[PDB]
């Protein structure tokens, strides 16, 4: 009979409650105070322009119909009470397929303060859409957005706000750093109004600033392309009469240049414009023909040649000048 007190409270609150109507429908606006706790920022799939994020999407509003007077003040209730009351229909504007986890029970909680304040947090994974400008790849940065707001309620029906200060309203957990390629720098939030045919809606935008780490692409693309150019430029140190020997340097370096040219764009999307890695490849693709037509010049004119005695110095020089000016203009942007 000790739990019959709390049973009579909850059956009284739901008695006459209409869950199809927002609180304060004819009097005021339903202020929904929200904040996000990011448990783990998941991997960013640069091929499909998207990022996975696992959040603790907390929301809080005020309902004056769910006021109670009892032996406690906060009602840490079960999950199925939340479907029997009004909840905001917050959806993500740039989501693509977000899952609400259900193992083992549905991962939601609902707390009802005695004055009518509610808390209602959800555990979600959100596969959002992050439009990126892969021009400076792989030395590029991206502010992947996450925009959420009400769906059926206009800015004269449900306005959103942050619970704490906007600096302290999106918190990223320290252990959750599931990015392997990028690097999370910080987060910034904002609020604004969007325009639609149905009306004006309050949107809530946050931006996650990411910087790509280039340590993968150095040891996969940049170093083997540099070693290919040096492998092409050692052909000037041989003799003129070794015609089958120097054409092996000529053919296989430009054939391993064009395989790396193909295989460096497989992870990229089908981008129409040219990235900064494509500029490094195509210039390095130009030195290996410049070594190849140098050999075709000296084979046509076949003592040591003045062409090989000049290309032994100029070819490592102009490759060094390009390498000095390419890294300076892109690592210091």
């Amino acid at each position, epitope marked *: 009979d000790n739990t019959t007190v709390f049973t009579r409270i909850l059956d009284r609150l739901l008695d006459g409650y209409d869950n199809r109507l927002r609180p304060g429908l004819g009097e005021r606006v339903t202020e929904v105070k929200t904040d996000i706790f990011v448990t783990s920022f998941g991997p960013v799939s640069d091929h499909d322009m998207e990022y996975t994020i696992d959040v603790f999407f907390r929301q809080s509003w005020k309902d004056e119909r769910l006021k109670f007077k009892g032996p406690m003040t906060v009602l840490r209730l079960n999950n199925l009470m939340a479907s029997k009351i009004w909840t905001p229909d917050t959806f993500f504007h740039n989501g693509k397929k977000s899952v609400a986890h259900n193992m083992t029970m549905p991962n939601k909680l609902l707390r009802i303060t005695e004055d009518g304040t509610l808390l209602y947090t959800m555990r979600l994974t959100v596969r959002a859409e992050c439009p990126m400008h892969l021009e400076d790849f792989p030395m590029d940065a991206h502010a992947c957005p996450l925009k959420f707001g009400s769906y059926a309620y206009t800015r004269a029906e449900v306005v959103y*706000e*942050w619970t704490r*200060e*906007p*600096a302290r309203s999106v918190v990223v957990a320290e252990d959750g750093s599931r990015l392997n390629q990028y690097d999370l720098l910080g987060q910034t*939030v*904002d*609020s*604004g109004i969007v325009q639609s045919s149905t009306g004006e809606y309050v949107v809530m935008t946050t931006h996650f600033h990411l910087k790509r780490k280039i340590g993968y692409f150095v040891i996969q693309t940049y170093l083997p392309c540099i070693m290919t150019v040096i492998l092409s430029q050692v052909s000037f140190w041989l003799n003129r009469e070794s015609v089958p020997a120097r054409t092996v340097f000529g053919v296989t370096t430009v054939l391993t240049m064009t395989t790396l040219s193909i295989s460096a764009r497989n992870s990229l999307p089908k981008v129409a414009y040219a990235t900064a890695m494509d500029w490094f490849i195509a210039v390095c693709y130009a030195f290996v023909f410049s070594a190849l037509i140098e050999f075709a010049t000296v084979n046509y004119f076949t003592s040591v040649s003045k062409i090989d005695r000049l290309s032994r110095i100029a070819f490592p020089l102009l490759f060094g000048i390009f390498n000095l000016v390419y890294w300076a203009t892109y690592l210091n942007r």
Partner: antibody
Amino acid sequence: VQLQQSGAELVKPGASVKLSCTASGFNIKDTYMYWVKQRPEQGLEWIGRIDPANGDTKYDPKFQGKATITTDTFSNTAYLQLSSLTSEDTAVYYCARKGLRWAMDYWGQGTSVTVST
Amino acid sequence: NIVMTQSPKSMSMSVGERVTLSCKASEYVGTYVSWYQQKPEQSPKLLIYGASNRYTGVPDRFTGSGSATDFTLTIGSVQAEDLADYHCGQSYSYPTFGAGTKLELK
């Protein structure tokens, strides 16, 4: 709606002062209380904020250990507490609440402190 | 910490012309930048909550523009009831304020 503060006071340096801001027309438990320092012919200077739902209080870094706020829900009034006040802190103190977009929409009439002889 | 600079300190114009205030933050504040006036020996009030969002009761001549860093307050026609200095605040972090900008009439 209407925000009320008490009248001006004359205090000696090194003493302690008590200043109140009474709110009417709205409860304190849902909106923050913002208190701000307004020196004469000078700009504003925020000193601290109040979350009355849990008693959370965060102060300005300059005024740490200088001001203290208690808030009574029954009296509908928040209180100042200046422990080690000096003669330099001669200004007018304003009362404010959190607005629609974290602004300060409703303001009190302001109480001026005077530390002299 | 956040600092707010209001430029210039003071200016003098007559009734019925254009004035453009300036307020620049140290780092990124999104939209929560508030404009407060201070009539002499009265209490401050609210002009624009957020950026470019007029408060209730103020005239339509007051308008603002919002960005990441710089924020301007614009009055199309200065009237005889605007004898107040204007303070630019921020709310993306713990709130801070500028020095204000006084004005006077001939």
